Amino acid sequence: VNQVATDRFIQDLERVAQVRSEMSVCLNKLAETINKAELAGDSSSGKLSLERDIEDITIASKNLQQGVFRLLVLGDMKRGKSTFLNALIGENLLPSTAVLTVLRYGPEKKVTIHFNDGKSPQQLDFQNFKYKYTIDPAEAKKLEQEKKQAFPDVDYAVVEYPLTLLQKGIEIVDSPGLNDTEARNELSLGYVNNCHAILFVMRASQPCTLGERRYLENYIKGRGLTVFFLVNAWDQVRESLIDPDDVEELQASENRLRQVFNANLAEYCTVEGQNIYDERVFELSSIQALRRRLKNPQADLDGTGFPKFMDSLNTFLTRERAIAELRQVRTLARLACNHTREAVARRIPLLEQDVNELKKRIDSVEPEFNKLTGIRDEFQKEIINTRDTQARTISESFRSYVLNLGNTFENDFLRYQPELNLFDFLSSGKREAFNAALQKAFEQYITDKSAAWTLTAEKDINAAFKELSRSASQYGASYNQITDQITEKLTGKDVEDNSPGWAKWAMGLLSLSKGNLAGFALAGAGFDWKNILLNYFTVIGIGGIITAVTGILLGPIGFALLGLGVGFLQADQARRELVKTAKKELVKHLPQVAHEQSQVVYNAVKECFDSYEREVSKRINDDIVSRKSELDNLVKQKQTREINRESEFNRLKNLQEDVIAQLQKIEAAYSNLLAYYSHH
Amino acid sequence: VNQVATDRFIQDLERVAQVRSEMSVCLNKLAETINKAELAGDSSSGKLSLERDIEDITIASKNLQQGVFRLLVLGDMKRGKSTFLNALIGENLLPSTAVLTVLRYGPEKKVTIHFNDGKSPQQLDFQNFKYKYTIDPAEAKKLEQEKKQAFPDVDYAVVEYPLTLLQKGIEIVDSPGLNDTEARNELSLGYVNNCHAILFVMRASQPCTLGERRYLENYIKGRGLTVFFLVNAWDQVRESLIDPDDVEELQASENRLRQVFNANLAEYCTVEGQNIYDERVFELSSIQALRRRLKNPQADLDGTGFPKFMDSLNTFLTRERAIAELRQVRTLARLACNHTREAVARRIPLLEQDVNELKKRIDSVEPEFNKLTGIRDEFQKEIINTRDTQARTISESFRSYVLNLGNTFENDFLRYQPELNLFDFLSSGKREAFNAALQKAFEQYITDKSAAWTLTAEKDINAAFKELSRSASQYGASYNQITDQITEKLTGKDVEDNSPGWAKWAMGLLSLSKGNLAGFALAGAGFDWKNILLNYFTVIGIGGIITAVTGILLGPIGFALLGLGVGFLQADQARRELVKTAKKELVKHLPQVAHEQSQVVYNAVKECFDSYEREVSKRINDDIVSRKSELDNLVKQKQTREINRESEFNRLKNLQEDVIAQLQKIEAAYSNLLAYYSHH
Ligand SMILES: Nc1nc2c(ncn2[C@@H]2O[C@H](COP(=O)(O)OP(=O)(O)O)[C@@H](O)[C@H]2O)c(=O)[nH]1
């Protein structure tokens, strides 16, 4: 019958959730199989040394169960975020919320809240929670005049609720505002870079506010994020026409409005040169959608804008993000399958050969193994000569940037009009409650300048890793050759892209983490954790610069202030000096403080590349070492126990079948789910 | 036929405009008549000494032509003020205005703008003016984060336009915002106290904002002003109901909303104990009214809320303010008529008596005249012993208040969170561009505290003048008796409230100024000019207190600041001192600065009562002196010229008729206009 798109969403979601689950199943089965066989190893012809795969496959499975689509819902004050969500999840839940709220599936309506001032994760009931954590439009505009946070004792609150949408694997993060303090919090907790998509609610009666346009630039622009812009309260446009019942006039006003959003959002709706504006921007009437879902949740929403929007989001999540993520699981399973497969194909034959003939064959390949180690060294160098070059060139960029900011300060000092909270200043006394006060006053300035640079930084670190990838690809290709030989000189018989395993990780085609510190958006969930780590330290930098230029000018200021309240200095006499002193002190230290500060940025860029090196290293040594033990364990047995060669044959032939069997089920689940899409 | 209320308004207005005009006519005629006769005086039996009446009557007339109803239209950002006005005056004039705009009748669409930075009153065309003086919702919220004024080089702009409403005698003052800077400007230019009514546009989607509620308290509460609250965009309430087409549900939401406005506005809709809330608060849909007036200006507005509102405003203006004002003109005319009448009735008879018999009769009353001077002295004392007592008790009140504000400063310092504009601070250097910066930061605090006290001050000055009035009443009563005798002992034949003239002014029953410095709201237009003069000096006071406590603490601060940026003082070491110093200095000067400041408030209260004394004096001496010259001029002639006693008789009998004739026409115009209302 009339299949509403709200059904299609729940359907697809459910479907995926099944593929996800079924793979999880095979993955364990696969792990359990490689594992049992490996334990039997010592009591037989020795282990095959497949522990790295067991582990990897095990994490992969555990990841698959905890799988979920995270959506970050951003939006300014009173735009409809609340009503919007209710409409989306078909309930009148949120109150038509002054604190980051994570909405997730749960059996009972519960609400636990995590603090930051120390307090251990409390607990409450939505009934009381709704009253304890909210703000009247009055005392909320008040905590706005000072750009302060509502409850800084809270990091975020979680809300479990029986909502079928959340059941099928959806988590919602509802951000309370666009201000900068709340911004960092979200950035620091991950979110902005730990969610599959961003839902940025806007309103037709307030087209791309300065507040919005600013946020977009400081936190979204060129950061490679998927964000759908929902122009809410679209229905209001017509309640202002000469004739609110003239589709032609209406259309014309809507058009006036539409060229405004396009002008400001086009820039954010493109993917690799291709423009997808109308698959990301949606004119909506949340109030009309909600109303309809209140008379019947299986209600058709055509006319509210929702359908068109939901189908895009459905597609993105279930036919793109799921595929990519699922595909990786297949890749990991094929790796496990092959390593096992080949390992066995190498052993069975060596089982017949005698200890002497064996060590002769093993020594035969010693030169090949060392070559592998040549790659492990040749690539490690390059890896490090890249961190060094990068951690240098960037530190330079920052140092140079901070300094040069001083050449424009005057003009900027005017554009931004730092407001100093006189109460915050005096109030306490800690050499922090006084510096924070000044730090706040320069919040917008710090954020802006700060966000701009890290964009530039990231654009480079990206390319770096993009090269290292291409590099690993080739080293991987040769590594394989050297590997093929080790098999031939051992066995006698010479046996997606099929590069080695460690190569798969180094290229960012695979990964067990949702995110990583390189530009690998095809790895894991794709999440860019270097926007966190980077655009956080940089703030400490550009802020320290202030925290520094602060202690630099206090003295000169205090002098002027003091030399006036006593009468030693007259009006405008101290100002021809405060300056004389300022300029003097700055040109006397700024360059040093810049340099001193650009040393934190150094450690951050060095870190990015040290994580990568640390991992790629593990995996490569891990390969080398296992292939070698593969051979050593045999000898350790031929000289110690006595194996029944034919029973070993079945046991290992069995191992091989059982694993492949599992891989196929997975390969199927994937193919089927894909094919289903071929016909829909 | 279907007479729309927009017609009734234009009608009534027109009608009044006629009565007003006709009286103006008779007034001149009356003045011209007393004048011609007076010139003939020297060549005849001498002047009657009616110059005070000629003058008074002449001003009264000139005032009558320049007559107009002034409306102050207040309102927050984006509430509908603009759309509202357009709907009111049936045009799509204002742009759906970042500067006080005075909208008045004019032949050609013109726009002159008066500055304050010096520039001489420029000039423009609405075409260009519309573009040169406006602000995008963007760069307008920007000049909001710092609570600054858009164009401080402008005081206001006037806009002449061919609008029949303005023709019939209506002026509109459209205020751009509720902020405090714009507030003072309006207060300083008069407006808030130089307009017959205030139109405070509010919006249903933003019920009594903090911004609004604050304004109301600081500028309207207990100030005796007439303000109509227009709850605009009332239509929007239903676009949020489960079912927007359920009058019952609607009504219930409206009710939820209605108890909010009543709770906050009731307080402002009462007159002498009587509550008239629903004659002042009006739920409106400006957008629907405008639309209808675009298809036809003679359009019925029933259903928009406008009709109900307009009729109240019509009533207030044309059947209350006009009456009161017109009635005064009648009072002034009766005074002129009587003074003339009686003067003549005293002379004709003395014309027969011979010089000797005359001086005998004149000397006969010398004791009576001195008695009159006894009143002129007995009342002048009291007048002055009242200014002294008041200018003292108030100065005390202020001094005491300023000091005591210090006992609560800490708590207040928290409530208000003074933001200091770091740019403004440093920037220049004048011992003003630095103090202003600090003055601004404390704007809200100064305004609030300041406005509160002057309310208290006014409540007293009122009573003072209310007493002086009652006092004058009685002195007037006796003055009359003494006057009656002077006539009897002279003539032989013993000849609204009918107190003497000077008594009429002292009681505030009459006045040639729209406003005055006493609580006389029955005098002139009623305007309270002591809310201007008073609530302006007080700001200079509570602000100077700051400007003072500023220079008091600079030194201690500068010391702490300086003793930190050099390392002589550690963190939280200087703060146990900044305080040590603060408290020390304040308790060491505040009391003196308070006292020094409470000396401006002294001059303001002394002024109020000196204006009153100055005037009441003039009028009383003026009476005494004329009545005396009345007698002297006769003698000056009986001894110098020779008059034809019978011709003088006709000339003066004529004078008498001609004046009375004019008074009657006026007495009629008034009575008729009133009676017309008796039947409508
Ligand atoms: N006409 C219309 N009004 C809306 C729409 N969405 C929300 N509103 C109105 O805005 C109010 C709710 O704002 P809200 O959702 O709480 O803002 P939020 O808390 O920032 O998400 C309600 O009273 C609605 O009347 C919409 O799509 N169309």
Ligand SMILES: Nc1nc2c(ncn2[C@@H]2O[C@H](COP(=O)(O)OP(=O)(O)O)[C@@H](O)[C@H]2O)c(=O)[nH]1
């Ligand atoms: N629904 C509704 N909208 C209104 C009403 N009055 C004004 N508006 C809307 O508010 C906007 C105009 O705001 P405006 O009058 O310029 O605010 P102002 O400049 O502060 O007076 C228009 O786009 C209208 O759609 C009203 O009575 N009802």
